[PDB]
Amino acid sequence: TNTKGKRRGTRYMFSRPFRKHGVVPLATYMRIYKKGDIVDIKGMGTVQKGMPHKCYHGKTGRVYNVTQHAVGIVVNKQVKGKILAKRINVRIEHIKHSKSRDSFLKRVKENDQKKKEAKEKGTWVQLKRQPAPPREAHFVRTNGKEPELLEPIPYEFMA
Amino acid sequence: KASGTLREYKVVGRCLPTPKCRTPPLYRMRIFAPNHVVAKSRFWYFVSQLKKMKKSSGEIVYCGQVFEKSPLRVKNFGIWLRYDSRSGTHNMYREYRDLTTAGAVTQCYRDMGARHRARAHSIQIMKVEEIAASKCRRPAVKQFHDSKIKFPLPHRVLRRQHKPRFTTKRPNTFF
Amino acid sequence: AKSKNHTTHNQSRKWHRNGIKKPRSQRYESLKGVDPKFLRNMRFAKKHNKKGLKKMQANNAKAMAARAEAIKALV
Amino acid sequence: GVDIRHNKDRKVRRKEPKSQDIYLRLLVKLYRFLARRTNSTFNQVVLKRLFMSRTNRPPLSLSRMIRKMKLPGREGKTAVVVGTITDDVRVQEVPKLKVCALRVSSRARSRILKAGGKILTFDQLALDSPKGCGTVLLSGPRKGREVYRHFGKAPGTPHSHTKPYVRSKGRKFERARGRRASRGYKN
Amino acid sequence: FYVPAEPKLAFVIRIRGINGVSPKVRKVLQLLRLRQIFNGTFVKLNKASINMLRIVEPYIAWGYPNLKSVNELIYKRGYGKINKKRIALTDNALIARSLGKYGIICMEDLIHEIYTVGKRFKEANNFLWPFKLSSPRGGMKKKTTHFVEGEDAGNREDQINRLIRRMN
RNA sequence: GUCUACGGCCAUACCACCCUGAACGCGCCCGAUCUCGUCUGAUCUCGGAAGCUAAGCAGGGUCGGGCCUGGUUAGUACUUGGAUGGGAGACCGCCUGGGAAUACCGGGUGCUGUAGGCUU
RNA sequence: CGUUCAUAGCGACGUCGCUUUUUGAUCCUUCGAUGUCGGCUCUUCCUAUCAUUGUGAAGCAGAAUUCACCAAGCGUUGGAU
RNA sequence: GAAACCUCCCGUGGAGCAGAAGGGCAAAAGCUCGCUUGAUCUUGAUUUUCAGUACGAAUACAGACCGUGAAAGCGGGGCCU
RNA sequence: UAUCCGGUAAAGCGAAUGAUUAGAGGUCUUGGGGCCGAAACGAUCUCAACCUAUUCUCAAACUUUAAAUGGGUAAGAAGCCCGGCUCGCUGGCGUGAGCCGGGCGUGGAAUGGAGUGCCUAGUGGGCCACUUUUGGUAAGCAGAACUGGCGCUGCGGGAUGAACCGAACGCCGGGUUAAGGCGCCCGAUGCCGACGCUCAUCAGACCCCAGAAAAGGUGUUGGUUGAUAUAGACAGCAGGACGGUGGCCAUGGAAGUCGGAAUCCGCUAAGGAGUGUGUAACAACUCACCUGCCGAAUCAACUAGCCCUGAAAAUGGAUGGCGCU
RNA sequence: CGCAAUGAAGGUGAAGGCCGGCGCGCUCGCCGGCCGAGGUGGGAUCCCGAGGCCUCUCCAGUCCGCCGAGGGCGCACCACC
Ligand SMILES: [Mg+2]
Ligand SMILES: [Mg+2]
Ligand SMILES: [Mg+2]
Ligand SMILES: [Mg+2]
Ligand SMILES: [Mg+2]
Ligand SMILES: [Mg+2]
Ligand SMILES: [Mg+2]
Ligand SMILES: [Mg+2]
Ligand SMILES: [Mg+2]
Ligand SMILES: [Mg+2]
Ligand SMILES: [Mg+2]
Ligand SMILES: [Mg+2]
Ligand SMILES: [Mg+2]
Ligand SMILES: [Mg+2]
Ligand SMILES: [Mg+2]
Ligand SMILES: [Mg+2]
Ligand SMILES: [Mg+2]
Ligand SMILES: [Mg+2]
Ligand SMILES: [Mg+2]
């Protein structure tokens, strides 16, 4: 039976990468989280105040509270049969903005551009995405030179 | 791979074009298989080994059956192999005598099963080349190279053993 | 008479009989556990919204009249 | 062999009322018919409610019926209640109402009729309005029963406010180890 | 060379039973509506769809149906989903009633929507109740192994039409 | 073209030795009355401005180390899913999709924000 | 090693096996009980052959012999503690 | 004198940080000084074990009263487990 | 489709940590032992540790790298975009939050009716298989992961059978299948089935599975690589096998011959300073190069198929049986 | 038993708003009038309803429906303030 200790098994998780030890460079601290920012948690060894628990590393969630130098952040943690949305108080250093949402906002902005225009025109445009369709009919010109023959090569033992 | 009687297929394909490589080179093969479906698969297997190129990364351009151009000639075919033993992997040069390449490769696949308990999926056919009377290294072939060939069909054992299941006459096997 | 000591064998199955339901998201979640000094001040702000009502109502009527003038100019 | 779970194939809703009383069952015969032959979903809702339990059709107090009709616009209408109409002693002035109910208590009956109110039975409502047109369909507060105060996240489970089943309240019935901080802990 | 278009649409037959089947497979098999053995569905192809077929490969035989296949399946075993009651397409009054809000007003229209994979494919294809086909007459080769390697499972592209005829 | 002050990302920015630096800067530099501090005006603090780019600093250089980025290694190693495939086992081959890492060989060797100079 | 000679007979360092007449592991069966050692008595089987029949080997001259093959037909005893 | 003290050079930490080990740490989290009692008083929230109960341990705040620093700040015990 | 997380497989050790082989190079250090030195970083070796390039081989409790499978989020009306009010918070002005009031609709694929609350029994001995996996020589042993079974469950196949494969059962007719089969037992090959392989005085004969290995075999069949030979070979028989030379080390005797460093020339047609026999040691014998005869292929070394040796148990016996070439 | 809690107890015990005036409107204290169980989002259901859609003709034109875009009152219940 294994030890219940808080930091058990974070030998690798909380360990600054190769040649990225030392001073926590300052952008990290000086970037602003509001309420409802989508934020991915990633514990860090240098800063031990406000560390998240090893279960929430990797996990993404939303900011609910913002204190002086930390951010309350609702994240969903599964427990055997039940997913528990729960609220944890991570110090900034263990947290980035999750880009996952921004590619969405880019698309909605692009849609609002393509909805305003193409209204006065009349031609309705494809706003929905569509999965990669089968690759269409097309010609391939074997331009002058014929195809290159590939015989499989005879075995030989190298070692 | 399994079998039945194979057909030569021509299969040419290319790693599909990109920004960086706009008009990529075509690669052609001789892929013996029971049908185009497994032909194309077999094409991809051989190319994967040789070239950094997968079914996802490429497109088969032209798969097409290839017909023996001299069906009603009797030929001698040299065939080079690459089988897998229980032990290590090997090379051979088999020789068959047949009316077709397909027939000659089919013939090979049966022989290899017989003589080496080698199953389809172990065998790689590299080259199949029709060959003269000479340049035939195997005496099992060479004995049929002769103008006035002459042999009997000596102990001609009967079939139709159950047309008359029972009969008065003891049979005959001299003809 | 030693036992089996621990397992997780039939458990995933057991969990998924009744789903593994995601935690039921509402709009308007509580302000439980929000930095006290904030909550005081948003409470006070909420207290005095009724102060500055008469100004606000007039501003919307002026807006509504400007909308009605704009729609009349369009038509 | 097919893969479906047959687990929630049978829907558990009621079909008829569980009661055997004959007057209610006549109302059911009437509102089944109307439900099916009218387009009115009022009839369907009413029909649905005739099958429900006592618990499930709670009493609608006179004051609650007042204030719900005091609301702006539903004026010169009829309030409908598959439950019973009870009095409120803590309301005084009772406007002249129109009402449907399976029951109205004797006080509540007097007060309404004294006001110039009309009381209707459900057979009478149908003839008056078979498609439920110009009705206010109310309900009593379902979660009134003291029952519900024991339901929920259990007592002694942090941030629950759930009445425990206790023989008698008093200084020394619970309120020790697990409510005081002084005694063990608290939730 | 003329490399023709990669196919839009494929028929997908469930070719093994409903015992001892992994949960990820099982879910996809009930996202293709392939619950019983020897049920089949049309399926429009694309990166998403094709990969879902990749996750259920040794549980299905599938490929690119002929024109005739789409007819024979629709006429001989064409059943609507009409108020959730599997009902046989005996008249166009059924198809129209359901799919007529899309311009699809007859069996023929339906066949054209399925075969060309139109705008309104999702709605015509879902309208069709999944095709309960019989066992394969003349038998199969091998249930458990892939087509390429002798068996019946997996993509057999053109050759799905032979299988269709011996089952439909 | 380039610098100083405060920077962001933190080696394409590090290290070694070599060469070159106009003007403005930045420095070294000359002093200890006062501020301040030392065993020591070396450092630190303070008051300067005679010298000088020697050094720091910048820019460049090296079939340089290092780092960064491509190729190769290799569809190799590994690997999801499959079979009443093989094999006495150990292990291996196929199908279905995913797919690395050295050695070896190329190329690159800081970009840039705010505020203020100089080259008028 | 065997004077000499790896192998008549042997055989180190290594290695591959079989066997359940040793002892361990293990705890599947039996705790509403399967009588717990030895000896006596009696039958039958196995061969991994001590003797006996037929044979190959020798570092078998004879005598004595060990090595191996077919082989379990027939034997394999009397006592002291 | 291989080891005492002084001085110059190199030194990515190969030392040290009470203790096991792991992580973390260089004009520090090490060493040496100066001043100190945030190891003080008081509500709730949260995390960790978890049943998502307790205990312990911790995290973010908030209100007091202080410490220290030119200040920004940091500090309600021990860099973190 | 975007976007984070990861330190297992692999890989690496001319990158850290630890392990570890070899030689090059180095008075780095210095030594301990030498030999030639009185002694001398003198000359010459040497072994110690250290170092300069290289090099061999490794890691559950090492790692610069770094997969596959995998875990989060996100993919819109609770969303966007305007206008204005509230604050005891925050502040050069501004933030940030909370309020009102308008303005805008399908925002990846596939599927499916959802939500929600109360009472609640049995259970809390488990076992089995793929794959992964710890202890153990191993176990029908013990212990985890992952899915699926059996338990709760019949049916076709596997002769027999919890668990293998196929498939999951209302009561019946017709059809068709699976996995398995089709000499007879026993439904189906009573095909003029196709091509090979193999004879066993222990043949062989189908997942789980109920049985064999190393190592052998001109048994037979395929390969692979090399030869050879008309300058007529290859075997099969017949003729010589010397001298410089008791060569040198070894004397205990080795003039070819217990052993070992050597190891070339002559005559040459050609014979090794010698394969053996044997000798105290010789001798004597025996083992190339070439012919004479005969008359086309010959021969070597690997390799992998079937077959065989290897291969011993106790009541009489089991590819299921009968049998089968 | 229920219609009132909460405190160990002494005990205390579920109303608010608005408007006008008077005290300095001091987000505090006192005097007159009006409303009277707050508000956000979702809510079965009711309510209003542009507008169709025809009538054997060209228009007029009350009656009856069917649908109804759009907009409202919003039960219960839930979440939030
Ligand atoms: Mg247990
Ligand atoms: Mg059931
Ligand atoms: Mg299977
Ligand atoms: Mg000075
Ligand atoms: Mg200088
Ligand atoms: Mg200089
Ligand atoms: Mg370089
Ligand atoms: Mg000897
Ligand atoms: Mg025992
Ligand atoms: Mg007995
Ligand atoms: Mg014997
Ligand atoms: Mg400390
Ligand atoms: Mg404080
Ligand atoms: Mg690990
Ligand atoms: Mg490894
Ligand atoms: Mg029990
Ligand atoms: Mg056990
Ligand atoms: Mg049981
Ligand atoms: Mg199965």
PDB file of C-alpha atoms (C1' of nucleotides) in Angstrom, chain I residues 40-231:
ATOM      1  C1'   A I  40      69.795  11.488 -11.158  1.00  0.00           C
ATOM      2  C1'   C I  41      61.349  13.371 -14.565  1.00  0.00           C
ATOM      3  C1'   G I  42      68.963   9.963 -16.437  1.00  0.00           C
ATOM      4  C1'   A I  43      67.771   5.270 -19.872  1.00  0.00           C
ATOM      5  C1'   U I  44      64.421   1.424 -19.786  1.00  0.00           C
ATOM      6  C1'   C I  45      60.267  -1.269 -18.675  1.00  0.00           C
ATOM      7  C1'   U I  46      56.362  -1.713 -15.216  1.00  0.00           C
ATOM      8  C1'   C I  47      51.961  -1.592 -12.582  1.00  0.00           C
ATOM      9  C1'   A I  48      48.796   2.457  -9.428  1.00  0.00           C
ATOM     10  C1'   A I  49      45.473   5.884  -9.862  1.00  0.00           C
ATOM     11  C1'   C I  50      44.359  10.620 -12.452  1.00  0.00           C
ATOM     12  C1'   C I  51      44.057  13.072 -17.177  1.00  0.00           C
ATOM     13  C1'   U I  52      43.815  13.801 -24.007  1.00  0.00           C
ATOM     14  C1'   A I  53      41.338  11.931 -27.938  1.00  0.00           C
ATOM     15  C1'   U I  54      39.170   7.035 -29.081  1.00  0.00           C
ATOM     16  C1'   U I  55      36.821   2.140 -28.088  1.00  0.00           C
ATOM     17  C1'   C I  56      33.700  -2.448 -25.847  1.00  0.00           C
ATOM     18  C1'   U I  57      29.287  -3.246 -22.964  1.00  0.00           C
ATOM     19  C1'   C I  58      25.011  -1.658 -19.372  1.00  0.00           C
ATOM     20  C1'   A I  59      20.572   0.790 -15.484  1.00  0.00           C
ATOM     21  C1'   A I  60      13.227  -0.830 -11.735  1.00  0.00           C
ATOM     22  C1'   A I  61      15.104   3.018  -7.581  1.00  0.00           C
ATOM     23  C1'   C I  62      20.110   7.188 -14.354  1.00  0.00           C
ATOM     24  C1'   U I  63      19.207  10.417 -18.561  1.00  0.00           C
ATOM     25  C1'   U I  64      20.256  14.843 -22.927  1.00  0.00           C
ATOM     26  C1'   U I  65      16.200  12.792 -26.439  1.00  0.00           C
ATOM     27  C1'   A I  66      11.517  10.477 -26.950  1.00  0.00           C
ATOM     28  C1'   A I  67       7.042   7.543 -29.356  1.00  0.00           C
ATOM     29  C1'   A I  68       2.354   4.561 -29.972  1.00  0.00           C
ATOM     30  C1'   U I  69      -2.001   3.860 -26.912  1.00  0.00           C
ATOM     31  C1'   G I  70      -3.630   7.760 -23.312  1.00  0.00           C
ATOM     32  C1'   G I  71      -6.073  12.544 -19.821  1.00  0.00           C
ATOM     33  C1'   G I  72      -7.765  17.580 -19.763  1.00  0.00           C
ATOM     34  C1'   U I  73     -10.231  21.876 -22.192  1.00  0.00           C
ATOM     35  C1'   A I  74     -12.812  24.134 -26.591  1.00  0.00           C
ATOM     36  C1'   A I  75     -16.057  23.803 -31.050  1.00  0.00           C
ATOM     37  C1'   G I  76     -21.748  30.055 -29.445  1.00  0.00           C
ATOM     38  C1'   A I  77     -28.088  32.880 -27.391  1.00  0.00           C
ATOM     39  C1'   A I  78     -25.559  31.133 -20.540  1.00  0.00           C
ATOM     40  C1'   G I  79     -22.863  33.729 -27.559  1.00  0.00           C
ATOM     41  C1'   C I  80     -21.312  38.236 -29.843  1.00  0.00           C
ATOM     42  C1'   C I  81     -21.772  43.662 -30.626  1.00  0.00           C
ATOM     43  C1'   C I  82     -23.552  48.776 -28.994  1.00  0.00           C
ATOM     44  C1'   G I  83     -25.806  52.611 -25.090  1.00  0.00           C
ATOM     45  C1'   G I  84     -26.161  54.090 -20.110  1.00  0.00           C
ATOM     46  C1'   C I  85     -26.242  53.672 -14.656  1.00  0.00           C
ATOM     47  C1'   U I  86     -24.239  51.485  -9.236  1.00  0.00           C
ATOM     48  C1'   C I  87     -19.481  50.822  -5.855  1.00  0.00           C
ATOM     49  C1'   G I  88     -17.697  51.905   1.041  1.00  0.00           C
ATOM     50  C1'   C I  89     -13.240  47.855  -3.948  1.00  0.00           C
ATOM     51  C1'   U I  90      -9.106  49.760  -7.244  1.00  0.00           C
ATOM     52  C1'   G I  91      -6.989  54.354  -8.927  1.00  0.00           C
ATOM     53  C1'   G I  92      -2.707  60.495 -11.864  1.00  0.00           C
ATOM     54  C1'   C I  93      -7.475  60.065 -15.349  1.00  0.00           C
ATOM     55  C1'   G I  94      -8.369  54.757 -15.118  1.00  0.00           C
ATOM     56  C1'   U I  95      -9.571  49.522 -13.457  1.00  0.00           C
ATOM     57  C1'   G I  96     -12.679  45.553 -12.301  1.00  0.00           C
ATOM     58  C1'   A I  97     -17.111  43.918 -10.912  1.00  0.00           C
ATOM     59  C1'   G I  98     -22.440  44.422 -10.657  1.00  0.00           C
ATOM     60  C1'   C I  99     -26.799  46.347 -12.677  1.00  0.00           C
ATOM     61  C1'   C I 100     -30.503  48.289 -16.343  1.00  0.00           C
ATOM     62  C1'   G I 101     -31.917  49.181 -22.141  1.00  0.00           C
ATOM     63  C1'   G I 102     -31.666  47.917 -26.958  1.00  0.00           C
ATOM     64  C1'   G I 103     -29.234  45.306 -31.661  1.00  0.00           C
ATOM     65  C1'   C I 104     -28.019  40.762 -33.991  1.00  0.00           C
ATOM     66  C1'   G I 105     -29.588  33.275 -34.768  1.00  0.00           C
ATOM     67  C1'   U I 106     -28.769  26.828 -37.148  1.00  0.00           C
ATOM     68  C1'   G I 107     -21.942  28.027 -36.015  1.00  0.00           C
ATOM     69  C1'   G I 108     -17.485  20.163 -36.997  1.00  0.00           C
ATOM     70  C1'   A I 109     -18.940  14.463 -38.057  1.00  0.00           C
ATOM     71  C1'   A I 110     -22.254  10.477 -36.468  1.00  0.00           C
ATOM     72  C1'   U I 111     -26.208   8.994 -32.695  1.00  0.00           C
ATOM     73  C1'   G I 112     -29.879   9.390 -29.370  1.00  0.00           C
ATOM     74  C1'   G I 113     -36.089  11.813 -26.155  1.00  0.00           C
ATOM     75  C1'   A I 114     -33.901  14.329 -21.722  1.00  0.00           C
ATOM     76  C1'   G I 115     -33.748  16.026 -16.699  1.00  0.00           C
ATOM     77  C1'   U I 116     -34.881  15.218 -11.493  1.00  0.00           C
ATOM     78  C1'   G I 117     -36.399  13.373  -6.400  1.00  0.00           C
ATOM     79  C1'   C I 118     -37.712   9.897  -2.932  1.00  0.00           C
ATOM     80  C1'   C I 119     -37.972   4.567  -0.659  1.00  0.00           C
ATOM     81  C1'   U I 120     -34.808   0.545  -1.599  1.00  0.00           C
ATOM     82  C1'   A I 121     -33.100  -5.181  -1.528  1.00  0.00           C
ATOM     83  C1'   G I 122     -29.044  -8.507  -2.526  1.00  0.00           C
ATOM     84  C1'   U I 123     -23.866  -7.992  -2.376  1.00  0.00           C
ATOM     85  C1'   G I 124     -19.080  -6.597   0.240  1.00  0.00           C
ATOM     86  C1'   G I 125     -15.217 -15.405  -0.119  1.00  0.00           C
ATOM     87  C1'   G I 126     -14.570 -14.594  -6.269  1.00  0.00           C
ATOM     88  C1'   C I 127     -12.443 -16.984 -10.238  1.00  0.00           C
ATOM     89  C1'   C I 128     -10.737 -17.431 -15.996  1.00  0.00           C
ATOM     90  C1'   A I 129      -8.416 -15.586 -20.920  1.00  0.00           C
ATOM     91  C1'   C I 130      -5.654 -11.785 -24.441  1.00  0.00           C
ATOM     92  C1'   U I 131      -2.092  -8.224 -23.571  1.00  0.00           C
ATOM     93  C1'   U I 132       0.975  -5.578 -19.723  1.00  0.00           C
ATOM     94  C1'   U I 133       3.093  -6.991 -14.962  1.00  0.00           C
ATOM     95  C1'   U I 134       5.745  -8.012  -9.353  1.00  0.00           C
ATOM     96  C1'   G I 135       7.517 -12.230  -6.199  1.00  0.00           C
ATOM     97  C1'   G I 136       9.166 -17.236  -7.364  1.00  0.00           C
ATOM     98  C1'   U I 137      13.591 -22.632 -10.559  1.00  0.00           C
ATOM     99  C1'   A I 138       8.434 -23.269 -11.425  1.00  0.00           C
ATOM    100  C1'   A I 139       3.045 -24.344 -10.327  1.00  0.00           C
ATOM    101  C1'   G I 140      -3.842 -26.057 -12.342  1.00  0.00           C
ATOM    102  C1'   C I 141       1.346 -21.037  -7.107  1.00  0.00           C
ATOM    103  C1'   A I 142       0.913 -16.071  -4.973  1.00  0.00           C
ATOM    104  C1'   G I 143      -0.016 -10.527  -6.361  1.00  0.00           C
ATOM    105  C1'   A I 144      -1.663  -5.856  -9.611  1.00  0.00           C
ATOM    106  C1'   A I 145      -3.293  -3.250 -14.478  1.00  0.00           C
ATOM    107  C1'   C I 146      -6.535  -3.335 -18.949  1.00  0.00           C
ATOM    108  C1'   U I 147     -10.706  -5.159 -21.466  1.00  0.00           C
ATOM    109  C1'   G I 148     -13.903  -9.407 -22.076  1.00  0.00           C
ATOM    110  C1'   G I 149     -15.666 -13.718 -19.962  1.00  0.00           C
ATOM    111  C1'   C I 150     -17.450 -17.543 -16.186  1.00  0.00           C
ATOM    112  C1'   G I 151     -20.189 -16.736 -11.578  1.00  0.00           C
ATOM    113  C1'   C I 152     -26.254 -15.475 -13.243  1.00  0.00           C
ATOM    114  C1'   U I 153     -26.119 -18.724 -19.221  1.00  0.00           C
ATOM    115  C1'   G I 154     -28.845 -22.334 -22.313  1.00  0.00           C
ATOM    116  C1'   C I 155     -27.501 -23.270 -27.889  1.00  0.00           C
ATOM    117  C1'   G I 156     -23.512 -24.961 -32.801  1.00  0.00           C
ATOM    118  C1'   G I 157     -18.331 -26.304 -32.694  1.00  0.00           C
ATOM    119  C1'   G I 158     -13.658 -27.906 -29.543  1.00  0.00           C
ATOM    120  C1'   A I 159     -14.751 -36.495 -28.880  1.00  0.00           C
ATOM    121  C1'   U I 160     -15.101 -35.366 -23.210  1.00  0.00           C
ATOM    122  C1'   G I 161     -15.109 -30.076 -20.515  1.00  0.00           C
ATOM    123  C1'   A I 162     -17.251 -23.188 -16.020  1.00  0.00           C
ATOM    124  C1'   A I 163     -13.841 -19.951 -18.642  1.00  0.00           C
ATOM    125  C1'   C I 164     -11.565 -21.623 -26.029  1.00  0.00           C
ATOM    126  C1'   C I 165     -14.076 -20.292 -31.102  1.00  0.00           C
ATOM    127  C1'   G I 166     -18.985 -19.120 -33.058  1.00  0.00           C
ATOM    128  C1'   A I 167     -23.247 -17.150 -31.233  1.00  0.00           C
ATOM    129  C1'   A I 168     -26.379 -15.343 -26.556  1.00  0.00           C
ATOM    130  C1'   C I 169     -32.325 -18.417 -25.901  1.00  0.00           C
ATOM    131  C1'   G I 170     -41.022 -16.559 -25.873  1.00  0.00           C
ATOM    132  C1'   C I 171     -43.530 -21.033 -28.765  1.00  0.00           C
ATOM    133  C1'   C I 172     -43.324 -23.009 -34.151  1.00  0.00           C
ATOM    134  C1'   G I 173     -42.827 -23.501 -40.563  1.00  0.00           C
ATOM    135  C1'   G I 174     -39.558 -22.230 -44.672  1.00  0.00           C
ATOM    136  C1'   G I 175     -34.872 -20.271 -46.041  1.00  0.00           C
ATOM    137  C1'   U I 176     -29.383 -18.837 -44.917  1.00  0.00           C
ATOM    138  C1'   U I 177     -25.261 -18.794 -42.225  1.00  0.00           C
ATOM    139  C1'   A I 178     -21.051 -18.813 -38.278  1.00  0.00           C
ATOM    140  C1'   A I 179     -17.191 -21.355 -35.883  1.00  0.00           C
ATOM    141  C1'   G I 180     -16.433 -26.063 -37.268  1.00  0.00           C
ATOM    142  C1'   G I 181     -16.687 -30.159 -40.821  1.00  0.00           C
ATOM    143  C1'   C I 182     -17.776 -33.794 -45.213  1.00  0.00           C
ATOM    144  C1'   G I 183     -13.925 -42.591 -45.532  1.00  0.00           C
ATOM    145  C1'   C I 184     -17.553 -45.266 -41.863  1.00  0.00           C
ATOM    146  C1'   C I 185     -19.252 -44.380 -36.736  1.00  0.00           C
ATOM    147  C1'   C I 186     -22.044 -39.130 -38.119  1.00  0.00           C
ATOM    148  C1'   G I 187     -25.516 -34.402 -41.449  1.00  0.00           C
ATOM    149  C1'   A I 188     -21.961 -33.211 -45.912  1.00  0.00           C
ATOM    150  C1'   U I 189     -16.745 -34.347 -51.520  1.00  0.00           C
ATOM    151  C1'   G I 190     -19.860 -41.160 -54.060  1.00  0.00           C
ATOM    152  C1'   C I 191     -15.471 -33.691 -57.053  1.00  0.00           C
ATOM    153  C1'   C I 192     -12.570 -38.244 -62.594  1.00  0.00           C
ATOM    154  C1'   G I 193     -10.785 -31.644 -57.331  1.00  0.00           C
ATOM    155  C1'   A I 194      -5.208 -28.834 -58.462  1.00  0.00           C
ATOM    156  C1'   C I 195       0.359 -28.737 -57.211  1.00  0.00           C
ATOM    157  C1'   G I 196       4.017 -30.826 -54.162  1.00  0.00           C
ATOM    158  C1'   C I 197       6.186 -33.172 -49.892  1.00  0.00           C
ATOM    159  C1'   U I 198       6.752 -37.659 -46.626  1.00  0.00           C
ATOM    160  C1'   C I 199       7.248 -44.496 -45.206  1.00  0.00           C
ATOM    161  C1'   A I 200       8.474 -44.214 -39.884  1.00  0.00           C
ATOM    162  C1'   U I 201      10.644 -52.621 -36.535  1.00  0.00           C
ATOM    163  C1'   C I 202       7.581 -45.223 -31.840  1.00  0.00           C
ATOM    164  C1'   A I 203       4.576 -42.592 -38.719  1.00  0.00           C
ATOM    165  C1'   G I 204       1.437 -38.459 -38.879  1.00  0.00           C
ATOM    166  C1'   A I 205      -3.104 -36.250 -38.333  1.00  0.00           C
ATOM    167  C1'   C I 206      -5.791 -28.892 -36.299  1.00  0.00           C
ATOM    168  C1'   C I 207      -6.521 -22.250 -31.137  1.00  0.00           C
ATOM    169  C1'   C I 208      -7.035 -22.919 -25.611  1.00  0.00           C
ATOM    170  C1'   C I 209      -4.915 -28.749 -25.255  1.00  0.00           C
ATOM    171  C1'   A I 210      -3.223 -32.213 -22.662  1.00  0.00           C
ATOM    172  C1'   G I 211       3.205 -33.013 -24.640  1.00  0.00           C
ATOM    173  C1'   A I 212       9.628 -32.893 -25.751  1.00  0.00           C
ATOM    174  C1'   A I 213      15.221 -30.228 -26.327  1.00  0.00           C
ATOM    175  C1'   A I 214      20.329 -29.649 -27.254  1.00  0.00           C
ATOM    176  C1'   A I 215      22.686 -32.228 -30.784  1.00  0.00           C
ATOM    177  C1'   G I 216      23.071 -35.590 -34.916  1.00  0.00           C
ATOM    178  C1'   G I 217      21.646 -38.458 -40.141  1.00  0.00           C
ATOM    179  C1'   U I 218      24.775 -38.975 -48.519  1.00  0.00           C
ATOM    180  C1'   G I 219      17.270 -40.850 -45.479  1.00  0.00           C
ATOM    181  C1'   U I 220      14.883 -37.900 -49.289  1.00  0.00           C
ATOM    182  C1'   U I 221      13.623 -32.916 -51.192  1.00  0.00           C
ATOM    183  C1'   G I 222      14.544 -28.045 -52.115  1.00  0.00           C
ATOM    184  C1'   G I 223      17.868 -23.577 -51.634  1.00  0.00           C
ATOM    185  C1'   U I 224      22.728 -20.600 -50.768  1.00  0.00           C
ATOM    186  C1'   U I 225      27.777 -19.985 -51.542  1.00  0.00           C
ATOM    187  C1'   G I 226      32.057 -21.551 -53.545  1.00  0.00           C
ATOM    188  C1'   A I 227      34.652 -24.785 -56.752  1.00  0.00           C
ATOM    189  C1'   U I 228      36.379 -28.311 -61.039  1.00  0.00           C
ATOM    190  C1'   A I 229      37.428 -29.907 -65.651  1.00  0.00           C
ATOM    191  C1'   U I 230      39.068 -31.518 -72.228  1.00  0.00           C
ATOM    192  C1'   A I 231      45.991 -27.546 -70.347  1.00  0.00           C
TER     193        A I 231
END
